[PDB]
Amino acid sequence: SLFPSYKLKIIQGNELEPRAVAALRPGMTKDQVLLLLGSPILRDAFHTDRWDYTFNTSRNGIIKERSNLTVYFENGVLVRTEGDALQNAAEALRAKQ
Amino acid sequence: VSLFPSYKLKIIQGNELEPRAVAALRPGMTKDQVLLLLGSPILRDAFHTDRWDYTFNTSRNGIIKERSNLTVYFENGVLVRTEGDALQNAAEALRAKQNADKQ
Amino acid sequence: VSLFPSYKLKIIQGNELEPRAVAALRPGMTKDQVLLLLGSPILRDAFHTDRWDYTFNTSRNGIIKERSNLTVYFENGVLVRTEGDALQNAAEALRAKQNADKQ
Amino acid sequence: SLFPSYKLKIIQGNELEPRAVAALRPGMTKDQVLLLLGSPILRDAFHTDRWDYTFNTSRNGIIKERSNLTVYFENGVLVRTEGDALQNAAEALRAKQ
Ligand SMILES: [Zn+2]
Ligand SMILES: [Zn+2]
C-alpha cells in the first residue's frame, strides 16, 4: 500500500456540561466551583489558585473537540475564567434555544 | 516538507482499560508513541503538556466494575514516570489471563 | 452521551483546488458541513472561529500554475458569505470541463 | 456497516519555520516581523497591533498540529508574543540539537 494506516484511540469521558460552565460568575468561592464542576485533577502549589479542567465535546456520536477551562482565584473567590469551554458552552446553549 | 498524500485512520472511542498496552510502557517513549499505545488523553494539546492523566473503566457484562487512573510524565519529550492504580490493575488482569490458560 | 465505538477516517493532505466542492457551497451550511466539503483550514480551532481562509493550488503536470484564495464567513454557526478568486477559478474550471465534453 | 466512514481533507501549507519564530524579540518593528514571518492574513482595525499567524506542524509525513502565534505591538514595536508556536519552535530546535 502506498498510504499508511493507523489505529488511534480517543479517550471518552468528562463530557462538557454547558449549564455548569455558563454558571460560573466572579465572586464564587472555591467551594462553589467544586459543587458546580467537581475537583480538578491537578492540586499542587502552582494550581492552588489556578484550576484546570478539560472536557470532551461530542456531536452526532463523534468526539469533535477537547475544550479547556481555567479558573483563577484570589482570596478564595473566582476572579476570572478563560478557555475554549466558555465559548463552547455559550454557543451550545444558544444552539439549544 | 514531505507529506503522505493520504493515509487511513481507524478511530476507537472509549475508555476501557487495555492491559497489554499499559504493560508495554517503557522509559524513553516519545509522546507520539504513548499516544498510539494508550490513546489520546482528554487534553487540548497533549504534544506540549508534560503530564497526561487517564481514567479507565473495567467493565464486565456491560457494567463498570472499577475505575483505574493513570498518570504519565514526560521530560525532554520522552516518558520517565508513571503513577496510578491502572498499572497494578493491568498487571493483575494479565496474570489472571495466564492463570486461566492453565485452568 | 451516545458515541460510535469506532469509525473509519480517510485523510487527504493537500491544498489542490476542488472545483466541485467550492461550487457546492450554500448559505446556511454548518461549520461541520463546510469542513467536510472544503477541508480543515490552517486554524487551531475552526469550530469557534467565524472566518476561515484557504489558499488553494492549481497544478498541471506537477507544476503549480496559480494560487486561489478563499474566505468563508460564519454567523450563528452557519455560512453567510464567501470571498476570494477561488470562487471564479472553480466556476471557470467546471465550465472548461463542460466545453471539453462537447469537443 | 455498524461504524461510519468519513473523508477529511487537511489543508497543507504555512509549515512552521522554527528559526523564524524563535527569532522574535521585544522591540522589533512591525517591518522586522514582516521580513521574518511575512504579512498576516487579517489586517483590519482590531488587528493593526495584533497580528495572528497559524502554521502547520508535520512529523514523519503527517500533519500533526496547527500551531498559532499572536504578536502584539505598541508604538510600532513588538511588546509580547503568545501562542503554541513559541513552545512548538523552542522544542523543535532543542530536538534538532
Ligand atoms: Zn501544541
Ligand atoms: Zn473550540
Question: What CA–CA distance (Å, rounded) separates C18 from A64?
Answer: 24
Element (H, E) at A21: helix A18-21
CA-based nearest residue to D11, from C14, B4, C55, C45:
C14
Residue D23, judged by CB atoms within 10 A of its CB (0-12, 13-18, 19+), counts as middle
Beta bridge partners of C82: C72
C-beta atoms of C42 and D62 within 8 A:
no
Question: What are the grid coordinates assigned to B72, written together?
Answer: 504519565
How distant, in Å, are the alpha carbons of C40, C48, D65 from that of D8? 8, 19, 15
Contact indicator for A42, B49 with CB cutoff of 8 Å: no
SS3 content of chain C, % helix, strand, coil (to 5): 30, 40, 30
In sequence order, the 6+-apart residues with CB closer than 8 A to the CB of C75 are C50
C-beta atoms of B4 and A3 within 8 A:
yes
Which of B6, B9, B13, B47 is the best residue to mutate to test the D interface, defined by the most D CB atoms within 10 Å of its own CB?
Answer: B47
The total number of residues written for chain B in this structure: 103
Resolution of the coordinates in A?
2.5
Residue in D59, D87, D94 nearest the CB of B48: D87
| Amino acid identity, position B48 | H
In chain C, whose CA is at the least distance from the CA of D69? C44
End-to-end CA distance of chain A: 48
D15 marked among binding-site residues:
no
Question: What are the grid coordinates assigned to C67, written together?
Answer: 494560487
Residue in C6, C11, C14 nearest the CB of B12: C6
The alpha carbon of C15 and the centre of ligand 1 are apart by a number of angstroms equal to: 22
Backbone angles phi, psi at A95, to 5 degrees: -75, -25
Which of B1, B3, B9 is the best residue to mutate to test the C interface, defined by the most C CB atoms within 10 Å of its own CB?
Answer: B9
Complete edge-to-edge strand list for the sheet that includes strand D50-59? D50-59, D62-74, D77-82
The angle at the Cα of D50, spanning D47 to D55, to the nearest 5 degrees, equals: 100
Three-class SS state of D84:
helix
Secondary structure in 3-state letters for A35-49: HHHCCCCCCCCCCCC
Question: Cα torsion at C20, C22, C24, C25 (round to 10°)?
Answer: 170
CA-based nearest residue to D78, from D33, D45, D39, D17:
D33
Three-class SS state of A4:
coil
